Symmetry: C2
Subunit: 202 residues, 2 copies
Amino acid sequence: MDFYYMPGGGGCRTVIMVAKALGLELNKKLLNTMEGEQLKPEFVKLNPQHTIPTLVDNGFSIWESRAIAVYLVEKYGKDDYLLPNDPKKRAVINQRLYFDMGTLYESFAKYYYPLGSDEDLKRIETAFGFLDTFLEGQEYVAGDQLTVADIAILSTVSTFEVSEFDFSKYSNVSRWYDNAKKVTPGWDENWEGLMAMKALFD
Amino acid sequence: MDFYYMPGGGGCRTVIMVAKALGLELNKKLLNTMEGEQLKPEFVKLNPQHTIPTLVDNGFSIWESRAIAVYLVEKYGKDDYLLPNDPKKRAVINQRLYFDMGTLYESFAKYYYPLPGSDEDLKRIETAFGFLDTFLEGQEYVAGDQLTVADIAILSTVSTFEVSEFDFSKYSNVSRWYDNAKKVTPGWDENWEGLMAMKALFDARKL
Ligand SMILES: [K+]
Ligand code: NA
């Protein structure tokens, strides 16, 4: 399956980790969006929104990182790995995925993409507080086992770590993060993508 | 099923329409965020993020409008109604839901919440509608040829734009789709009611 991507991006790194966890091979096609490579007509035919990540899986084109992630698990995941069958448990996972996009990652973008006001820094703190509460009394963000929601939020929180946002006062988040780093497949490739992204801005 | 909401909100109205499509009664609990009612400790205990909509279904508290919508369909939907089983068709629906949140509704929020908004933010709306128009090329619905939760969520958003007097008549697939959506989507009447207070409210504040 073809994976149109940039290695530093959080959405791209989420899919990378999910694919590694599922033991799936990605044929990586680096599209430099800083050089408008995502506007090539061959790519636009696959994804008319011409966004990355985009995965092409035997003729099937899908984009939005969190949609890709859930698709790979629903198609290739064995048993209840990373995603259960239960509507209730699945709903919590889905709410955490929208949290990750609309609240947690959104606060990252608002504060670091103007590379940032005190107000937007407060927005990050507020988001981390919610995540900390989400993690009260459980090892993972949506329950008792690693899910796609953990992997997505790891992608985001590791971006914060490398950008040097200090979340050490968030006891649950810090404990979750250390565990997630050890148990999540593909962390090494997440870290590589982050490290270049850091060396980039640095 | 307790439904914590405001009638004007796009996310609240998505849930209202899905609940109607599914035959589900909501016990509506109006939670007015302009008076911090959602910050009250009793609500925070139900939803630590204290956002609306929040659904409490027989002890289970769930929030994020699009998560609530999918939960209702997965738990209560018959057959393949509103959400087919096929991982591929479900994936396209999920992509359209994230589109709705992060691109389409996002462009509404950035332009209209101040109302300033800037010309760049207006352009972002046009860009978002352009993509939606392309998604609808040759297609009756946003994610295939049946009504889905993605249509209902995007209908909530596009109807918000209409009542805010954004002209999308130049997007002819979106316009066609919208006119059809209004006729075939359950709960349209309640969505409109939520919008029209919104208009009347906005109009009166403008003087
Ligand atoms: K690599
Ligand atoms: Na994408």
